[PDB]
Design an enzyme around this catalytic site. Structure first.
Site, short mmCIF file in Angstrom:
data_model
loop_
_atom_site.label_atom_id
_atom_site.label_comp_id
_atom_site.label_asym_id
_atom_site.label_seq_id
_atom_site.Cartn_x
_atom_site.Cartn_y
_atom_site.Cartn_z
N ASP A 16 84.78 27.63 48.27
CA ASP A 16 85.99 26.98 47.67
C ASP A 16 86.41 25.78 48.53
O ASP A 16 87.63 25.56 48.76
CB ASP A 16 87.09 28.02 47.45
N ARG A 57 92.00 20.05 48.02
CA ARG A 57 93.15 20.87 47.57
C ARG A 57 93.39 22.04 48.53
O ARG A 57 94.53 22.55 48.56
CB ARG A 57 92.89 21.37 46.14
N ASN A 58 92.36 22.51 49.24
CA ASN A 58 92.43 23.77 50.04
C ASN A 58 92.54 23.43 51.52
O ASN A 58 92.51 24.35 52.35
CB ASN A 58 91.22 24.66 49.77
N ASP A 70 94.48 29.31 53.53
CA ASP A 70 94.26 30.74 53.23
C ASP A 70 93.05 30.90 52.32
O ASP A 70 93.02 30.25 51.24
CB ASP A 70 95.45 31.39 52.54
C1 LIG Z 1 94.44 27.06 50.45
N1 LIG Z 1 95.84 26.95 50.05
C2 LIG Z 1 96.81 27.58 50.71
O1 LIG Z 1 96.60 28.20 51.75
C3 LIG Z 1 98.19 27.51 50.14
C4 LIG Z 1 98.36 27.24 48.78
C5 LIG Z 1 99.64 27.11 48.26
C6 LIG Z 1 100.75 27.26 49.06
C7 LIG Z 1 100.60 27.57 50.41
C8 LIG Z 1 99.33 27.70 50.96
N2 LIG Z 1 99.19 28.06 52.32
C9 LIG Z 1 99.70 27.38 53.41
C10 LIG Z 1 100.47 26.24 53.23
C11 LIG Z 1 100.89 25.55 54.36
N3 LIG Z 1 101.53 24.33 54.27
C12 LIG Z 1 102.06 23.68 53.16
C13 LIG Z 1 101.40 23.58 51.94
C14 LIG Z 1 102.09 23.16 50.81
C15 LIG Z 1 103.45 22.80 50.89
N4 LIG Z 1 104.18 22.51 49.73
C16 LIG Z 1 105.41 21.73 49.94
C17 LIG Z 1 106.24 21.68 48.69
N5 LIG Z 1 105.45 21.14 47.59
C18 LIG Z 1 106.27 20.86 46.41
C19 LIG Z 1 106.97 19.51 46.49
O2 LIG Z 1 107.90 19.25 45.73
N6 LIG Z 1 106.49 18.65 47.41
C20 LIG Z 1 107.08 17.36 47.74
C21 LIG Z 1 106.24 16.28 47.06
O3 LIG Z 1 105.04 16.39 47.05
N7 LIG Z 1 106.85 15.21 46.50
C22 LIG Z 1 108.25 14.81 46.41
C23 LIG Z 1 108.27 13.91 45.18
O4 LIG Z 1 108.31 14.64 43.94
C24 LIG Z 1 106.94 13.19 45.27
C25 LIG Z 1 105.97 14.27 45.78
C26 LIG Z 1 104.94 13.60 46.66
O5 LIG Z 1 105.17 13.33 47.83
N8 LIG Z 1 103.81 13.28 46.03
C27 LIG Z 1 102.74 12.51 46.65
C28 LIG Z 1 101.41 12.89 46.01
C29 LIG Z 1 102.98 11.02 46.53
C30 LIG Z 1 102.22 10.15 47.29
C31 LIG Z 1 102.36 8.78 47.16
C32 LIG Z 1 103.26 8.24 46.26
C33 LIG Z 1 103.42 6.78 46.14
S1 LIG Z 1 104.97 6.14 45.82
C34 LIG Z 1 104.34 4.56 46.05
N9 LIG Z 1 103.08 4.49 46.33
C35 LIG Z 1 102.54 5.76 46.37
C36 LIG Z 1 101.07 5.88 46.61
C37 LIG Z 1 104.03 9.12 45.49
C38 LIG Z 1 103.89 10.48 45.63
C39 LIG Z 1 107.17 17.16 49.28
C40 LIG Z 1 108.25 18.10 49.85
C41 LIG Z 1 105.83 17.50 49.94
C42 LIG Z 1 107.53 15.71 49.64
C43 LIG Z 1 104.37 22.08 47.32
C44 LIG Z 1 103.45 22.13 48.52
C45 LIG Z 1 104.07 22.84 52.14
C46 LIG Z 1 103.39 23.27 53.26
O6 LIG Z 1 103.93 23.41 54.50
C47 LIG Z 1 105.26 22.89 54.73
N10 LIG Z 1 100.60 25.94 55.61
C48 LIG Z 1 99.87 27.05 55.76
C49 LIG Z 1 99.41 27.81 54.71
C50 LIG Z 1 98.59 29.05 54.95
F1 LIG Z 1 97.31 28.91 54.49
F2 LIG Z 1 99.07 30.15 54.34
F3 LIG Z 1 98.55 29.38 56.22
#
Ligand SMILES: CNC(=O)c1ccccc1Nc1cc(Nc2ccc(N3CCN(CC(=O)N[C@H](C(=O)N4C[C@H](O)C[C@H]4C(=O)N[C@@H](C)c4ccc(-c5scnc5C)cc4)C(C)(C)C)CC3)cc2OC)ncc1C(F)(F)F
Ligand SMILES: [Ca+2]
Lengths: 105, 155, 264, 89
Positions: free
Chosen positions: C132, C136-137, C150
């Site tokens: 996997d 994304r992971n 995880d």
């Molecule tokens: C394999 N998968 C997993 O394990 C797993 C899966 C799932 C969950 C957990 C897992 N395990 C672990 C997770 C972590 N960390 C971790 C993982 C994910 C999150 N969240 C945070 C909350 N989020 C929702 C949100 O609303 N996120 C905002 C967000 O993304 N926002 C705001 C706004 O709505 C625009 C959006 C943006 O920032 N989007 C990006 C894509 C963006 C980039 C650029 C632009 C622009 S604007 C102008 N130009 C550009 C290019 C616009 C948006 C935020 C708060 C990040 C800013 C879901 C994921 C936070 C985390 O730690 C703090 N640590 C350990 C683990 C462990 F493995 F368990 F140990």
């Protein structure tokens, strides 16, 4: 497309809109509604160029790009005096002061 | 209390196209879950950009250089909603129609260093107006008040 | 090794699993200072049927000790049942790479590839097939540190079978080896260099294998060094045994990293 | 209906009533009397630009289209600020 005009005679300036597709004659109908002189007593000009009644404003070079709300194009206006038309006479607007030193690079 | 202008933590993905239909360099600003503004990367004039946000997230848009206010779809705040038919949500960023006075203050500000405002031949009330620069915090205060007021209309 | 629920402050929900929601949180211990943690939670409390399969995901992560794999911090068996993991405070790689698309140097992008290569060489040494591997992971601990997330939460969420990341022999024969992990790694490297663009956008899952079998590959990312794209190409050898080992990827990525640091 | 706005140097600007009412000062000057407005302190280069602002404001207010910048040359910016401050627009 909409065009934005200043129709200018002596010290008189009308701010009005029309269309690229409206004729010179239809602009004269707008002036008549405002200054109460009929089209046959008006001459409209782009710079020194007398405009024909049948041409569209767009065909005369009054376009969306050269006649904007924030930068309207000037149309010169002369009325019939007696048996002849007065010369096109537009009084310039006042001019600003010298640019202050703190507003230069 | 809790800030009224904040994103809700929905984690419902929403694809958005930020369209900069302004001649300004645009700063997208996300209001986090604590209602604090977070700056995102700038958008050059005339550029669109696919971005990943979430349903119920709050964005506003500013001039990157000057912090002048911008509209998004003719309003101050943008809230991504559910994508439908897989159709991305357009965020049409535009200049507002500034008051003539505010547009005049923008231009004098862009020409005169602040330490030189007091050399200009104008009344004191306008020195103070020049010095009262746009800023997000002031606009958040104002937008919060307008929302609190709006929610209280009717009896 | 249980931990005292009182020393866990449940925070905001950062995602969902098969079992329950996942939360961020803090853990202050008697032996160390405050630590940011992820809390996996479980909806069901069936002794052998669901509680077993869920605590299994903690068992799996307990096997591993690597600087680029999220560590298990502890479990709570008392209800409700929770698994406590090291938090990657900068969240998910894909979101991070888009946010920093205009502020991240190539050297950092190659570093993330290097670090993942070290975790995957390690997994191969444990005779463990991840299955996997995708951007994304991968999770971001700091500007200079990514980790595999995880293993339980990684399953089939690459974004259903992740056809566009899978080696041909995984699509064709459901064969899953280190050599098929190397293919997925190649795609993950492509994802990183493309700043979290998914591979094969606008292509139907059912048409991927035919395209692979016609010799089509993901194209050279803008600003990808030719030597790196040549490494990816080798990862995408149709024949599994013509692919480099994670060992060789580790060495070649390290050389491409230093070659880049030395230029900027 | 059109209104006449007269500058300090005697220039007559004829503009739609609706456009002129953009200014709260012009609105106040046109309601109270139990139409033509004279401005002894605003010269024609400034008042012409104010009328261009009125056109701009009515055209682009509540438009879904892209809106262009209102351009102000450096030479007129101070006089136009004082005009806008006095006219409340
Ligand atoms: C394999 N998968 C997993 O394990 C797993 C899966 C799932 C969950 C957990 C897992 N395990 C672990 C997770 C972590 N960390 C971790 C993982 C994910 C999150 N969240 C945070 C909350 N989020 C929702 C949100 O609303 N996120 C905002 C967000 O993304 N926002 C705001 C706004 O709505 C625009 C959006 C943006 O920032 N989007 C990006 C894509 C963006 C980039 C650029 C632009 C622009 S604007 C102008 N130009 C550009 C290019 C616009 C948006 C935020 C708060 C990040 C800013 C879901 C994921 C936070 C985390 O730690 C703090 N640590 C350990 C683990 C462990 F493995 F368990 F140990
Ligand atoms: Ca009320």
């Amino acid at each position: 497309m909409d065009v934005f005009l200043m129709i200018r005679r002596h010290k008189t300036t009308i701010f009005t809109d029309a269309k690229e597709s409206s004729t010179v004659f239809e602009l004269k109908r707008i002036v008549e509604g405002i200054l109460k002189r009929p089209p046959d007593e008006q001459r409209l000009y782009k710079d020194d160029q007398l405009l024909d009644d049948g041409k569209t404003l767009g065909e005369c070079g009054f376009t969306s790009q050269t006649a904007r709300p924030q930068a309207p194009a000037t149309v010169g206006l002369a009325f019939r005096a007696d048996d002849t038309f007065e010369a096109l006479c537009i009084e310039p607007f006042s001019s600003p002061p010298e640019l202050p030193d703190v507003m230069k690079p | 209390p809790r800030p009224v202008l904040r994103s809700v933590n929905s984690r419902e993905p929403s694809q958005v196209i930020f369209c900069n239909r302004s001649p300004r360099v645009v700063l997208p600003v996300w209001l986090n879950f604590d209602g604090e503004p977070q700056p995102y990367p700038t958008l050059p004039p005339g550029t669109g950009r696919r971005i990943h946000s979430y349903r119920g997230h709050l964005w506003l848009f500013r001039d990157a250089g000057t912090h002048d206010g911008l509209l998004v779809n003719q309003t101050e705040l943008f809230v991504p909603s559910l994508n439908v038919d897989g159709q991305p949500i357009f965020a049409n960023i535009t200049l507002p129609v500034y008051t003539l006075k505010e547009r005049c203050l923008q231009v004098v500000r862009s020409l005169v260093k602040p330490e030189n405002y007091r050399r200009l031949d104008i009344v004191r009330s306008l020195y103070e107006d020049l010095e009262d620069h746009p800023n997000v915090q002031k606009d958040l205060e104002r937008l919060t008040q307008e929302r609190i007021a709006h929610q209280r209309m009717g009896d | 090794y249980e931990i005292q629920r009182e020393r866990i402050e449940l925070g905001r929900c950062i995602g969902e699993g098969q079992f329950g929601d996942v939360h961020q949180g803090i853990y202050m211990s008697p032996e160390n200072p405050a630590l940011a943690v992820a809390i996996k939670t479980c909806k069901n409390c069936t002794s052998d049927s669901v509680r077993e399969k869920f605590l299994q995901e903690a068992l799996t992560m307990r096997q591993f000790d690597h600087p680029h794999i999220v560590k298990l911090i502890g479990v709570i068996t008392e209800n409700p049942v929770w698994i406590i993991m090291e938090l990657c405070t900068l969240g998910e790689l894909r979101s991070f790479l888009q946010v920093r698309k205009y502020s991240l140097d190539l050297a950092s992008l190659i570093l993330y590839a290097y670090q993942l290569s070290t975790a995957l060489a390690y997994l191969e040494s444990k005779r463990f097939v991840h299955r996997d591997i995708a951007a994304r992971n991968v999770l971001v601990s700091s500007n200079d540190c990514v980790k595999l997330g995880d293993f339980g939460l990684s399953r089939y969420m690459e974004d259903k079978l992740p056809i566009k990341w899978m080696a041909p022999e995984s699509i064709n024969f459901r064969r899953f080896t280190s050599a098929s992990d190397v293919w997925m790694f190649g795609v993950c490297m492509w994802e990183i260099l493309m700043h979290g663009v998914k591979p094969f956008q606008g292509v139907k899952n059912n048409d991927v294998i035919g395209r692979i079998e016609n010799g089509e590959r993901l194209p050279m990312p803008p600003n990808c060094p030719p030597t790196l794209y040549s490494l990816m190409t080798k990862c995408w050898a149709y024949d599994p045994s013509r692919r480099p080992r994670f060992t060789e990827l580790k060495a070649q990525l390290s050389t491409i990293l230093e070659e880049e640091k030395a230029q900027q | 209906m059109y209104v006449k706005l007269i500058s300090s140097d005697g220039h007559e600007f004829i503009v739609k009533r609706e456009h002129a009412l953009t200014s709260g000062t012009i609105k106040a000057m046109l309601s109270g009397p139990g139409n033509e407005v004279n401005f002894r302190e605003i010269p024609s280069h400034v008042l012409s630009k104010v009328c261009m602002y009125f056109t701009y404001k009515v055209r682009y207010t509540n438009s879904s289209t892209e809106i262009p910048e209102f351009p102000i040359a450096p030479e007129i910016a101070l006089e136009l600020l004082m005009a806008a401050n006095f006219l409340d627009c």
